[PDB]
Amino acid sequence: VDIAQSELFRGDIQWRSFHLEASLMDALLNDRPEFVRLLISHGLSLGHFLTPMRLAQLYSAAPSNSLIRNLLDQA
Amino acid sequence: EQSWIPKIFKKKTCTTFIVTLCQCGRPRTAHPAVATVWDSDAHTTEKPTDAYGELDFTGAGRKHSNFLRLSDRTDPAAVYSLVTRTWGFRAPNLVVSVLGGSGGPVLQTWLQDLLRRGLVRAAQSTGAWIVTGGLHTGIGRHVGVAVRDHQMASKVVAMGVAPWGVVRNRDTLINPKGSFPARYRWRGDPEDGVQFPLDYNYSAFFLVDDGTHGCLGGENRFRLRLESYISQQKTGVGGTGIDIPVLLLLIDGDEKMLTRIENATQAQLPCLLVAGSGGAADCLAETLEDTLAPGSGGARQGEARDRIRRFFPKGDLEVLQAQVERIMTRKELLTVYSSEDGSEEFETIVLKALVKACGSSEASAYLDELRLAVAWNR
Amino acid sequence: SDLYWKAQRYRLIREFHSRPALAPPFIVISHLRLLKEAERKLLTWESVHKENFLL
Ligand SMILES: [Ca+2]
């Protein structure tokens, strides 16, 4: 994350909320804690970001035959 | 108990007509029968003020908000005497005048945290004053929610100056005999971009009347005049007290604010600018970072910043560059607050700014800054 | 064990909190008789302390 913050988030590049929505999903799906903290910290509106389709996508990322995955399958 | 208020204060009306629509925003049909280039003072009529009183916001609130409408051409001395004596407001140990536009309904989370944690706690600790725009928009709203969040987590005297005309529900404030009971429809359903509601977190309201139906920048003259008079005032008890430091906090802004800071610096008032605020405020911070940069390769850097740190309109114009040059002519007064990845601590910055602004060997001039150093724990 | 006793102390108090006020020999008559802004302010106060603790 230090490389990304030092290079991409040095302030020279003008970012946008939609420019980070895809990356935010990737960090959440790939278990990147420092990145989601960094991405949200850079003025990202979480309330408008989260959608029921996105939430369903997040729960669909249960790792293989995990215990949680079994509960959704039963549910 | 407010008999002198209509007498020692005045209100401004449009009077003449200077075009269907004139410059005052009040159209031809609704106009006095007394009806080139409009003049705020030559084309206005002075009448006794008829909007003073104590506002009581509907619902949650302190049931006390002293709001007064006063003409622009008024001495700040009378206003300060009214606030300190009649309204019972204690003489402030510090006055912070938050300035800026802060374009956008929302601001950065770190910026909001610095406002709520840094400014409000520092104001609360020393019993300071926070003078902002008395409107529920821009920086005025942001400081309003910061005060409200701190208050409910525990007061802080934060008042607002707003032009007369841009205030919604101005019909319920009119009572020449006094508006001590007053109900405000701050939650009015209709929304418009020329009239904004008053925040419910401000202890006092100063409605600047200049004979217009509503615009921006009509309170700048009174705002600077009030700040300078307080800076040249003692903390009560007559002359036995010490001076009251006055500091200006700047976040973002536009061309109108750039004149404000230049005028304030001309008025010998310490200024404080925060890095990363946005356009028209980081330009000064970057120019401070260059400091005594050489003219060769740096003279055009001003115009480069004019186009990248500010909007394209007036960027090619060198009038703003002249304003920049005038500002650095007294660069000792103003200082920059480094974000430091969200320091949320600027009492040291304020103390450093105030101590460097005085520049007097006499210990009397440094008494006020000493008390603030005592009031805070640094 | 000291932690366990402290934890189970709440269970004892809750059990006796809802018990009828009379003694078991006389408990029959008791059995026969048997048959906003403040919340938001509190949460903000808690949240402020959380950020202070984290900082
Ligand atoms: Ca001083």
From Swiss-Prot, chain A:
Tissue specificity as recorded in UniProt:
Widely expressed with a high expression in intestine and prostate. In brain, it is both expressed in whole cerebral arteries and isolated vascular smooth muscle cells. Prominently expressed in Purkinje fibers. Expressed at higher levels in T-helper 2 (Th2) cells as compared to T-helper 1 (Th1) cells. Expressed in keratocytes.
Q: Where does ATP 2 bind?
A: 16, 43
Give the record's PTM text. Answer: Phosphorylation by PKC leads to increase the sensitivity to Ca(2+).
Q: Describe the disease involvement stated in the record for this chain.
A: Progressive familial heart block 1B: A cardiac bundle branch disorder characterized by progressive alteration of cardiac conduction through the His-Purkinje system, with a pattern of a right bundle-branch block and/or left anterior hemiblock occurring individually or together. It leads to complete atrio-ventricular block causing syncope and sudden death.
User: Would you identify the family this protein belongs to, as annotated?
Assistant: Belongs to the transient receptor (TC 1.A.4) family. LTrpC subfamily. TRPM4 sub-subfamily.
Q: What is known of its domains?
A: TRPM4, is a temperature-sensitive ion channel, it adopts distinct conformations at different temperatures, markedly influencing where and how ligands interact with it. Decavanadate (a positive modulator), ATP (an inhibitor) and Ca(2+) bind to different locations of TRPM4 at physiological temperatures or at lower temperatures.
Q: How does it assemble?
A: Homotetramer.
What is the stated purpose of this protein? Calcium-activated selective cation channel that mediates membrane depolarization. While it is activated by increase in intracellular Ca(2+), it is impermeable to it. Mediates transport of monovalent cations (Na(+) > K(+) > Cs(+) > Li(+)), leading to depolarize the membrane. It thereby plays a central role in cadiomyocytes, neurons from entorhinal cortex, dorsal root and vomeronasal neurons, endocrine pancreas cells, kidney epithelial cells, cochlea hair cells etc.
What is the protein name stated in its UniProt record? Transient receptor potential cation channel subfamily M member 4
Task: Name the species this protein comes from.
Answer: Homo sapiens (Human)
- Gene name in the database record: TRPM4
Q: What fragment of the whole protein does this chain represent?
A: 406 to 480 of 1214
UniProtKB/Swiss-Prot annotation, chain C:
Family per record:
Belongs to the transient receptor (TC 1.A.4) family. LTrpC subfamily. TRPM4 sub-subfamily.
Question: Quaternary state and partners of this protein?
Answer: Homotetramer.
Disease annotation reads: Progressive familial heart block 1B: A cardiac bundle branch disorder characterized by progressive alteration of cardiac conduction through the His-Purkinje system, with a pattern of a right bundle-branch block and/or left anterior hemiblock occurring individually or together. It leads to complete atrio-ventricular block causing syncope and sudden death. Erythrokeratodermia variabilis et progressiva 6: A form of erythrokeratodermia variabilis et progressiva, a genodermatosis characterized by the coexistence of two independent skin lesions: transient erythema and hyperkeratosis that is usually localized but occasionally occurs in its generalized form. Clinical presentation varies significantly within a family and from one family to another. Palmoplantar keratoderma is present in around 50% of cases. EKVP6 inheritance is autosomal dominant.
Which purpose does this protein serve, as stated in its record? Calcium-activated selective cation channel that mediates membrane depolarization. While it is activated by increase in intracellular Ca(2+), it is impermeable to it. Mediates transport of monovalent cations (Na(+) > K(+) > Cs(+) > Li(+)), leading to depolarize the membrane. It thereby plays a central role in cadiomyocytes, neurons from entorhinal cortex, dorsal root and vomeronasal neurons, endocrine pancreas cells, kidney epithelial cells, cochlea hair cells etc.
PTM note says: Phosphorylation by PKC leads to increase the sensitivity to Ca(2+).
The Swiss-Prot or TrEMBL note on domains reads:
TRPM4, is a temperature-sensitive ion channel, it adopts distinct conformations at different temperatures, markedly influencing where and how ligands interact with it. Decavanadate (a positive modulator), ATP (an inhibitor) and Ca(2+) bind to different locations of TRPM4 at physiological temperatures or at lower temperatures.
Task: Identify the stretch annotated as signal peptide in this record.
Answer: none
As annotated in Swiss-Prot or TrEMBL, what is the tissue specificity of this protein?
A: Widely expressed with a high expression in intestine and prostate. In brain, it is both expressed in whole cerebral arteries and isolated vascular smooth muscle cells. Prominently expressed in Purkinje fibers. Expressed at higher levels in T-helper 2 (Th2) cells as compared to T-helper 1 (Th1) cells. Expressed in keratocytes.
Name of the protein described by the UniProt record: Transient receptor potential cation channel subfamily M member 4
